[PDB]
Amino acid sequence: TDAEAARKARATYRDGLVAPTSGIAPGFTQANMIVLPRDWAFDFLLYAQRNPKPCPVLDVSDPGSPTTLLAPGADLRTDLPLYRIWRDGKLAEETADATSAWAERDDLVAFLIGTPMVEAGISNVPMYLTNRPCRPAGRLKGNMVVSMRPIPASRVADAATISGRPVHVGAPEQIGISDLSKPDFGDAVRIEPGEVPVFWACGVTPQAAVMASGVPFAITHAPGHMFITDIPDTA
Amino acid sequence: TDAEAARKARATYRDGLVAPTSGIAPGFTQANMIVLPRDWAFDFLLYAQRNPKPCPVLDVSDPGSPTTLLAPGADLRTDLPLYRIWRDGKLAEETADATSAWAERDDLVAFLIGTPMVEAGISNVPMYLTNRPCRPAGRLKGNMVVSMRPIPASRVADAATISGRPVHVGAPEQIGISDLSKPDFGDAVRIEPGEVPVFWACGVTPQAAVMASGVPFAITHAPGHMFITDIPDTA
């Protein structure tokens, strides 16, 4: 509603207020970011279309253009709280501003991917590297990564039908997980009696893919620091 | 398609060929049956509207009329393979024809309630009496009953979103089940490693309700012997 005040958080991020995006501008879609050199653009788009579950694209920028239709007037170089510049497979840094690195390469292409449940009555979410590979696309391949969210045994279904508008459920060993204790990405959560490991797909997989494939240069958001769009979680 | 040949199975049941309805006329909706005296009609309808999940009504007959819009030209007195006449809370018999008992009371009202999954790649189903009560309605109350279907840990969600168009999942003790070994209704199934107890609501609950409430006279289908409608599982 009013559709604005999401443009107010982005505004605080230009000034340079690093911070998680959790709960902020609640109601408006929030996304992950992956920007690769043009010569890798086709491959990511293919990978994204071939693996819609773990790689749902909301918008792709025009080569070298840091803007998005998901939030007219924004700037992907400064509107996120924190970024991760990746060089030759590795992590080179973690700036609150990517203007500098965007200027490095001329034809850069960015992919925006990325509460109603809590309205029904239901750190960084523990994520695991599965044994379930994705469909390859050019130089891109790898197994999808998953996010574990402990759901009560009575709203798991209600978690399925509600979100529909989960990749795995229970049996963690069936996707190659022998202990929720050691997630593939730090953390660990308190999974109580009566709760159930519900797994999800997210922007880590597409990320882990480019990473493991030796992409020379890449820009991403820093975990927990997504790009808040002007799109209301209802379209 | 052709929408007929479901009227061919019903036809075999008039002759008197008791037998399960499993797999028959696949593609066409199949239902449970509950027929109570008029003076209980209002209560069941209320109970049914107040508990849509465990009591989904597809059609209600006009008092004393054994027909249904769900299959023009059928006769609820002879078109099911086997029936259960219930007298004063108890089970009085199990005939293949209910014509006789329908003639007993003048204003009888029948409720029709009641594969695509197996198209995705996914005895009598084990059912349990929970600890989760339904919303009462007049002389009707009681806890919903559930059906357990062992679903692979990768199609549980896919079992939720597919059927949407489950009441509980996992944690059986959270709904008052301390051992899937002894179902509330005989049977028992082989729940393998990597599978997950997925619970469902069905016509037993509405049945168990009328039963435990002392309804003098009632007619039902016999487990596994439903009424096959002319409605295709796609409307």
Closest by Cα among B118, B131, B208, B137 to B167: B131
- With tokens 């289908």, the residue in question is B221
B86, B169: one domain = no
Residue of B156, B191, B200 to mutate, testing the A interface (most A Cβ within 10 Å of its Cβ):
B156
A194, A228: one domain = no
Buried-state track B127-150, b at ≥16 Cβ within 10 A, e below 16 = bbbbebebebbeebebbbbbbbbe
Helix (H, G, I), strand (E, B) or coil at A58: coil
Helix (H, G, I), strand (E, B) or coil at A109: strand
What angle do helix axes B157-164 and A157-164 make, rounded to 10 degrees? 60
The Cα B182–Cα B167 span in angstroms is: 20
Breaks (C-N over 2.5 A) in chain A follow: 114, 122, 165
Please provide the size of chain A in residues.
235
A74, A22: one domain = yes
A51, A119: one domain = no
Contact A76, A109 (CB under 8 A): no
The Cα A127–Cα A199 span in angstroms is: 9
Handedness of CA A77, A78, A80, A81 (dihedral sign): positive
Tokens for A178? 């022998």
Angle at A50 (CA atoms; ends A44, A54), nearest 5 degrees: 80
Helix (H, G, I), strand (E, B) or coil at B142: coil
Contact A210, A32 (CB under 8 A): no
Please report which residue ranges of chain B form alpha helices under DSSP H. Answer: 9-15, 38-50, 99-102, 157-164, 204-212
Q: Name the residue type at position B118.
A: V
Handedness of CA B35, B37, B38, B44 (dihedral sign): negative
Q: Running DSSP on this structure, what letter comes out for residue B214?
A: T
B14, B127: one domain = no
The Cα B3–Cα B12 span in angstroms is: 17
Closest by Cα among B113, B133, B226, B124 to B185: B124
Domain CATH number, residue A153:
3.30.2040.10
Q: Name the residue type at position A45.
A: L
The Cα B6–Cα B13 span in angstroms is: 11
Name A167's Cβ contacts closer than 8 Å, sequence gap at least 6: A53, A54, A132, A144, A146, A175, A199, A200, A201, B154, B157
The Cα B89–Cα B110 span in angstroms is: 18
Residue A179: how many CB atoms within 10 A of its CB?
10
Tokens for B71? 């299959």
Closest by Cα among A179, A233, A226 to A204: A226
Contact A189, A195 (CB under 8 A): no
- Name the phi and psi angles at A133, rounded to 5: -65, 160
CA–centroid distance for A28 within its chain = 15
Question: Closest Cα of chain A to B74: distance in Å?
Answer: 35
A28, A70: one domain = yes
| Domains of chain B: total | 2
The Cα B144–Cα B127 span in angstroms is: 11
CB-based burial of residue B75 (10 Å sphere; 0-12 exposed, 13-18 middle, 19+ buried)?
Answer: middle
A75, A183: one domain = no
Name B127's Cβ contacts closer than 8 Å, sequence gap at least 6: B145, B146, B147, B148, B183, B184, B185, B187, B202, B204
Residue A123: how many CB atoms within 10 A of its CB?
11
Q: Determination technique for this PDB entry?
A: X-ray
Contact B44, B205 (CB under 8 A): no
- Tell me which chain A residues have a C-beta less than 8 angstroms from the C-beta of B164: 160-161, 164
Contact A229, A30 (CB under 8 A): yes
The Cα A106–Cα A103 span in angstroms is: 7
B105, B125: one domain = no
Across-strand partners of B198?
A: B149, B169
Using CB atoms, which residue from B153, B160, B168 is nearest to A160? B160
What angle do helix axes B38-50 and B204-212 make, rounded to 10 degrees? 130
Helix (H, G, I), strand (E, B) or coil at A117: coil
The Cα A116–Cα A232 span in angstroms is: 12
The H or E element spanning position A87 is strand A83-87
A87, A132: one domain = no
User: Which residues of B97-142 form beta strands (DSSP E)?
Assistant: 109-112, 127-133
A4, A107: one domain = yes
The Cα B82–Cα B91 span in angstroms is: 14
Contact A121, A185 (CB under 8 A): no
Is the CB of A164 less than 8 angstroms away from the CB of B168? no
- Resolution, expressed in angstroms to one decimal: 2.8
Using CB atoms, which residue from A153, A175, A198 is nearest to B171? A153
Using CB atoms, which residue from A166, A173, A193 is nearest to B157? A166
Bridge-based pairing of strands B59-60 and B109-112 is: antiparallel
What angle do helix axes A204-212 and A38-50 make, rounded to 10 degrees? 130
- Tell me which chain B residues have a C-beta less than 8 angstroms from the C-beta of A159: 160
Name A11's Cβ contacts closer than 8 Å, sequence gap at least 6: none
Tokens for A119? 């309205």
Domain of B66 in residue numbering reads as: 1-114+212-235
Is the CB of B174 less than 8 angstroms away from the CB of A194? yes
User: Which residues of B79-142 form beta strands (DSSP E)?
Assistant: 83-87, 90-93, 109-112, 127-133
Bridge-based pairing of strands A83-87 and A217-221 is: antiparallel
Residue A193: how many CB atoms within 10 A of its CB?
8
Inter-chain CB pairs, A–B, below 8 Å = 78
Is the CB of B156 less than 8 angstroms away from the CB of A166? yes
Using CB atoms, which residue from A160, A169, A194 is nearest to B153? A169
Handedness of CA A77, A78, A79, A84 (dihedral sign): positive
A58, A123: one domain = no
Q: How many helices (H) and strands (E) does chain B have?
A: 5, 12
- Tell me which chain A residues have a C-beta less than 8 angstroms from the C-beta of B131: none
Q: Running DSSP on this structure, what letter comes out for residue B193?
A: B
Buried-state track B22-59, b at ≥16 Cβ within 10 A, e below 16 = eebbeebbbbbbbbbbeebbebbbebbeebeebbbbbb
Is the CB of B164 less than 8 angstroms away from the CB of A160? yes
The Cα A180–Cα A201 span in angstroms is: 16
The Cα A228–Cα A220 span in angstroms is: 14
Longest dimension (CA), chain A: 53
Q: Name the residue type at position A221.
A: H
A39, A140: one domain = no
Question: Closest Cα of chain A to B226: distance in Å?
Answer: 26
Is the CB of A164 less than 8 angstroms away from the CB of B164? yes
The Cα B133–Cα A69 span in angstroms is: 49
Residue A194: how many CB atoms within 10 A of its CB?
14
Domain CATH number, residue A43:
3.40.1640.10
